[PDB]
Amino acid sequence: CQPSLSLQRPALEDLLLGSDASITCTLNGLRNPEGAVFTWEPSTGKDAVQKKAVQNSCGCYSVSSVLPGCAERWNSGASFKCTVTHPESGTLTGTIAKVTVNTFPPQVHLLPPPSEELALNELLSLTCLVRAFNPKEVLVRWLHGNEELSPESYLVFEPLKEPGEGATTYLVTSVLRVSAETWKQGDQYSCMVGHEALPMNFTQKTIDRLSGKPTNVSVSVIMSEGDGICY
Amino acid sequence: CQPSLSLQRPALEDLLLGSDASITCTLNGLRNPEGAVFTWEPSTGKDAVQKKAVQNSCGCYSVSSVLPGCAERWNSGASFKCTVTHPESGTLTGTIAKVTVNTFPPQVHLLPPPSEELALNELLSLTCLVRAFNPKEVLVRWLHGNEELSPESYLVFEPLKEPGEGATTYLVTSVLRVSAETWKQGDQYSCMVGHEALPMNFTQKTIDRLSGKPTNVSVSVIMSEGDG
Amino acid sequence: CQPSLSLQRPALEDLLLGSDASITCTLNGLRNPEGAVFTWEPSTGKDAVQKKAVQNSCGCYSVSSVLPGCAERWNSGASFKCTVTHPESGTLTGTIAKVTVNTFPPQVHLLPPPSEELALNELLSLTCLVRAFNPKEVLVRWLHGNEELSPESYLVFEPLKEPGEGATTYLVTSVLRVSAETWKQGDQYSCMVGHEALPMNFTQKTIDRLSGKPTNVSVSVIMS
Amino acid sequence: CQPSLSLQRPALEDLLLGSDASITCTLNGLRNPEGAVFTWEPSTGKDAVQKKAVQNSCGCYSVSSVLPGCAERWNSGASFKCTVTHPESGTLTGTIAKVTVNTFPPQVHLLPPPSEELALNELLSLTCLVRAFNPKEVLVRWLHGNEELSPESYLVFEPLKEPGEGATTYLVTSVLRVSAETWKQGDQYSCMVGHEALPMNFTQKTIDRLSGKPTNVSVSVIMSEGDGICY
Amino acid sequence: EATILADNKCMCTRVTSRIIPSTEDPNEDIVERNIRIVVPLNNRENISDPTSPLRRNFVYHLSDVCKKCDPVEVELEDQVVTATQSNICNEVPETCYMYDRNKCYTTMVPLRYHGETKMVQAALTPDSCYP
Ligand SMILES: *[C@@H]1O[C@H](CO)[C@@H](O[C@@H]2O[C@H](CO)[C@@H](O)[C@H](O)[C@H]2NC(C)=O)[C@H](O)[C@H]1NC(C)=O
Ligand SMILES: *[C@@H]1O[C@H](CO)[C@@H](O)[C@H](O)[C@H]1NC(C)=O
Ligand SMILES: *[C@@H]1O[C@H](CO)[C@@H](O)[C@H](O)[C@H]1NC(C)=O
C-alpha cells in the first residue's frame, strides 16, 4: 500500500449527453490523510474542487481533486497534466488526454426475439449487440416508441476485448425485456448507443414485428426501360 | 485487518466436467502466515490442504483450507461446516450448503447472426442467451461441428439480475465469431451450457444456416412497362 | 433591277400524279409590267397563259407566263425552250428538261418510336428517313389505316445535300405524331415517297407496333 | 425598301457556350449610305459599335450596330430597347424581350439504324429527334466515342412548328452517317442538345450497338437475405 | 393499407408489409412482405458515367434496400439529440443502378465553339435538375 497517482478520465455520459465533463486527479496508498497538494497545469475553466480523504480496504487513504468545465478542451482532443505533492514524501506527476488515434466506429446490430420465446405470448428478449469501439466505454439506452425506458429495465453487460489477431475491438451486449403484448400491438423498440469516435453524436437501431423475420415473402420483379430513372 | 471465516463452493467446472470438487474454507485477518489450526466436519473423510502463503495488498495474511471430496453432498444438497481458532481472534465458524429454494432449471435460446453480417463477408456473430436461476453459476462453451472450442475464442459476459418481482433470475450472453465461408458451407455451431440443477448437467442448442421456420417465397417477373 | 430570264422547273406535285403539268417562263428585273412576249419553242401548239405582273419590296417587276403541257415530253427528256421579248429592250432565252444524266432512286426507312416515348403513352414520334435522292424535290406523305393524312399533320424537313464524296444526293426527314393508343391497338402506318427517277408513282414503307424483335429477355430471379 | 427598324437577338451559341452576348439594331430601306445614329436605352459605358452598312440586291441600304455584354441581363429576363435616327427622317424605336412564359426545353430521343441498311453493313444512319421545345433556336452537335465529330459529316435540319394546340413548340431532326464497322465494334455516339430554357445549357443522349437488344439477352436478379431485418 | 418499411430511389425496392391474420385462430397472425424490385433493362454498369457497358447483373442487399441515413431527434431524459440510423452510409459513393429523379446527373463534354474547346456540363436526366 504505497503512495501512487492516477487520473480518472471523464465519463462518456458527460461528454456525449451531459453538459459538464470533469477530470479527477487521485492519490491512493496514503497513510497520512489530507495535506496532499493537487495542481493542474491547464489552470483554466473552473477551479478544481478538493475532496475529503477516504479510507480503502487496507486503511490507507484516497485523496483527490476534480477539475470541472473541461468538455470543451476534450472535444478538441486536448490534454491534461496533474502534479501532486504527497501528504508525506515526494513529487509525482501524470497525464491524460482524450485522443487514441486508432478507433473503430460502432456497428449496432439488433437481434429480434427467439421463436421459442415469442410463440408463448409471454415475454420477449430484444438483444442489442454493439460491436467495435476502441476506447472501452459505452452508453446504452433503450426507447419504447418515442420515450426513454428507465435504466433499471436494461441488462447492459460490460465491454470485453474480442479474441483474435489484428486491431483491438470489443463487444457490448444489452438485453431489454419486452412484453409480448406490446410487441403484438406493434410498439417499436430501439437501442441507442454512444461512443466518441462516431459522427452526429449517437447511433440507434429500431426493430418491431414488421422488420423481424417474415413468413412466405412475396417478391415481384419488374423489368423497366424509359430513361432508367426511378420515379 | 480484522478476522473472519468464509466458505467457497467448488467451481461448477469441478462438478460437471468430471468430479474433482472441493470446498475452500478461507481464514482471513491474519498478521502471521502460520495463522491457526482449523478443523473439519463435511460428513467424514480425512483430507485437508492448508496453503499459508497468501497476502493481500494490505500486507495481511489469509489461509486457504481445501477439503476434497465434496461433490456427492452438493449433489444431495447437504451442508458443510468449517471452524478455526486463531491467536488473533479466538474461534471463527461458518457453514455452506447448496441452495435449492430458488433453484430452477435454465432456459437457453440462440440468436442467429444479424442481417448486415450475412450480406457482408469477413465474419459473423452468433449469440447465445441464457437465463439463470438465483443460485447462479454458468459454464458457457461452444461447438464447431462436434469439436469443443477453446475458451480463447469466446466472448462471455457476467450475469446480471433481471428486472421483475417474485423471483431472482439473471441473464448472460456469449458471442461466437463464425467464418462466413463455413456458415455458407453448412458447418453447424452450437452453444453448450452447464448449470447446477439441470438433470443432465449440460444442455445444448444449435444454429444452422437454415435455422428458423422455412418459407414459401413467391417469386415472379413482370415484363410489362411502367418502370417504377 | 437587273433584267434576267429564268424558267421554273415543274414541281413534283402534279407531275408524277396529276394531269396538265406546266412550265413557267419568268422575266425579273423589269421596270415595265407590260410588253413582255413569251415565245415558246417546244412547238406543242399550246398557248402559254400570261400572268399578272408583281413587284419586289424595292419596286422591281417580275412578269411571267405558263405553258400547259409538260409531263408527257418533260419526263421523256425533251428540252422546252423559251425566248422572251423584253418589255423594254432585247430578248432572253433558256430551257427546261428532265435531267436523266445521273439520277438516283430513293431509299425509304421507317423507325419505330423510341421506348422513352412508349413508356409515357401520350403521343409517339414515327419517323420516315428518306435517303439518297439525286436532286432535292420529294413528295413525302403518310397513311393511317391506309388513308391519306392531311398536310397539316406533318413535320417534313427541307431537303439538304448529303455529306460525302463521289455522290450528288439529298436527304429528307419527316415526323408524324401518333396517339400511343392507336399504336398499341395495331393501327397501320405508312410513309409514301414520290420522286422523278422511279419505277412507280408510290414508293412506300410500313410500320406497326409489331416486328421480329429481340424481346425474350430471360430474367433469372434468385433468392439468395 | 421603305425605311424601317428591326432588332435581332444574340446567337444561342454566344449565349450557351461563349461570353460575347450582344444585340443587333438594324435600319433598312433608307437610300443614304452615310452614317446614321444608334442610341441604346441601357446606356452602358461599354463601347457600342456601329459597324459597316451593306447594299442589298435592289441597291437598298442596310445599317446596323451591336451592343456587347448582353449576358446577365438576358439570363435575368431583362428587356432591351433601341432608338435610331435615320439620315433621311426622324427616329424609330423598338425592343427585344426574352420569352419567360413558355420556356419549355426539348425532350431528346435517339434512334438506332433501320434494319434494312443494318442488314447490309456499308454505311448506317443514326438519328436524333429534339421535340416539344418553344424558342426557335437549338444547338445540336453530334459526338463520337467521347470525342466531338466534325460538322461536315452530320446533317441538321431547321426547327419546324409542331401541329395541334398549345404553346408553340418545334421539332428538329438530325442524321449522322456512321461507318458500319464502328457500329459493329460498339463505338459510342451521342446527340448533344443545347437551349436557354433548360436549367443546364445542354443535355445528352447516347447510342451504341447495345442501345436496342441482342437476340440472346438475360439478366441476373438476386435478392439477398430476403427474410432479413428490414429497417 | 400496408406499412412501407423501405422506399429506395436508386434501386426502386418498395418493401411494404402487413399483419395478415391466419386461418388457424383469430389471435395468431402472420407477417408478409412485398419486395417490389424494378430492374433496369437499359442502363450502364454505372449511371454516373455514360461510357460504361450495359448492366446485365443486379444484386440487392436487403440491408442496403431498407436503409436509413436521415438523422432523427430523441428525447433522452432532458437532452434532445441527433441520431445516426445506420452503420452503412459512409462516403466513395455507393454503387447505384437507377437514376434518382430528385438528384442531378451530369457529364462533362469537350465541345468546340468559336474555335476553342470548352467543357460543357450536360444533363443525363434532363427532365430533372431544375431549381
Ligand atoms: C460513376 O462514374 C463516375 C465517372 O468517373 C464516377 O464519378 C466521378 O468520378 C470523377 C473521377 O474520380 C470525379 O472527378 C467526379 O467528381 C465524380 N462525379 C461526381 C458527381 O462526383 C463514379 O465513381 C462512378 N461510380 C461508381 C460506383 O463507380
Ligand atoms: C408451403 O405451402 C404448403 C401449403 O400446404 C405447406 O404445406 C408447406 O409447409 C409450405 N412450405 C413452407 C416452407 O412454408
Ligand atoms: C427467342 O429466343 C429464340 C431462341 O432460338 C429465338 O428463336 C427467338 O427469335 C427469340 N425471340 C423471340 C421473340 O422469341
Residue numbers in the entry:
A (entry chain C), D (entry chain A): 237 to 467
B (entry chain D): 237 to 464
C (entry chain B): 237 to 460
E (entry chain J): 3 to 93, 97 to 136
Reproduce the article's own wording on this structure.
Secretory (S) Immunoglobin (Ig) A is the predominant, mammalian mucosal antibody; it is a polymeric antibody assembled in plasma cells that link two IgA monomers and a single copy of the joining chain (JC) to form dimeric (d) IgA (and to a lesser extent, higher order polymers). The pIgR uses five Ig-like domains (D1-D5) and a cytoplasmic tail to bind and transcytose JC-containing antibodies to the apical surface of epithelial cells; there, the pIgR ectodomain, called secretory component (SC), is proteolytically cleaved, releasing the SC-dIgA complex into the mucosa where it is called SIgA. The IgA CH3 contains a C-terminal extension called the tailpiece (Tp), which along with the JC, is required for IgA dimerization and subsequent pIgR binding. Our work describes the structures of mouse SIgA and its precursor, dIgA, which lacks the SC.
To investigate SC’s contribution to the conformation of SIgA, we determined a 3.3 Å average resolution cryoEM structure of dIgA, which contained the same components as SIgA, except for SC. The dIgA structure revealed two IgA monomers arranged similar to those in SIgA; Fabs were disordered. The centroid axes of FcAB and FcCD were bent 98 degrees relative to each other (compared to 97 degrees in SIgA), and the centroid planes were tilted at an angle of 19 degrees (compared to 30 degrees in SIgA). These results suggest that the bend in SIgA is conferred by JC binding to heavy chains and/or interactions between the Tps from both antibodies. The 11-degree difference in tilt between the two structures suggests that SC binding can influence the conformational relationship between the two IgAs. Aligned individually, the structures of the heavy chains and JC were largely superimposable with equivalent chains in SIgA; however, differences were apparent in regions that are bound by SC in SIgA. In particular, TpD, which forms part of the SC D1-JC interface in SIgA, adopts a different conformation, and the three C-terminal residues are disordered. The three C-terminal residues of JC (Tyr-Pro-Asp), which bind SC D1 CDR1 in SIgA, are also disordered in dIgA. While SC may play a role in stabilizing the conformation of SIgA, the dIgA structure suggests that SC binding induces relatively small changes in the bent and tilted relationship between the two IgAs. In the SIgA and dIgA structures, two of the four accessible sites are occluded by JC wing interactions with CH3A and CH3C.
